[PDB]
């Protein structure tokens, strides 16, 4: 479940 700026 995520990690950046998307």
């Amino acid at each position, epitope marked *: *479940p*995520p*990690y*950046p*700026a*998307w």
Partner: antibody
Amino acid sequence: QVQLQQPGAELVKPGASVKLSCKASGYTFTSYWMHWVKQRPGRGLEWIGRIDPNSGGTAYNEKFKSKATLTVDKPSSTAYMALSSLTSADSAVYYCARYDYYGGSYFDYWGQGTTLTVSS
Amino acid sequence: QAVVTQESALTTSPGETVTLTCRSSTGAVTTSNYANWVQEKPDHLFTGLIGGTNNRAPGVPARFSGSLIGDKAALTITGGQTEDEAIYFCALWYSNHWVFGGGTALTVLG
């Protein structure tokens, strides 16, 4: 028609580096992320990392953190992955795949991959 | 950290509904695993079909859909077509990296 072209094969020697190219076209290169996968028969697929054309900001699979280096060139619209201290364990097929994240979210388009054979 | 596992091989007939599944070993496959499904055809023909568990990639035939069946993610081909005979991979996101499954060889008797 969206496409990604990659060399079909590359022969390189153990202990050297290779720079695999993945030419993109058919869209705006900077609006989609580019991911690289490693395949060896019997071993399924292995996600190496991801890059974004704009920031150049990467997210590396921890196992390939110092083995691979993702990079891109805006004018030519091509993504690059450099493998560094090559050995027999790096012989595999390397694919680049596009992924959309703002208006959808998934892997969509894949190049045919470059079969890398590391031997002397 | 997670071995994703898919059915070895499945066989269906033209016109039927076939379901491919995907087991995660950390636990039940959720909506934050953003399960992705990928179709592989001869000559390294890799195509994305579903992303984020149930989001069909633009252009993908409607007979393909992704979902969740119990504690796993699943791919459902409604009215399986002779051209769907391909290998299907599963891809689960795990907080900062994807892990792929072995892949399921699908046969739609053509």
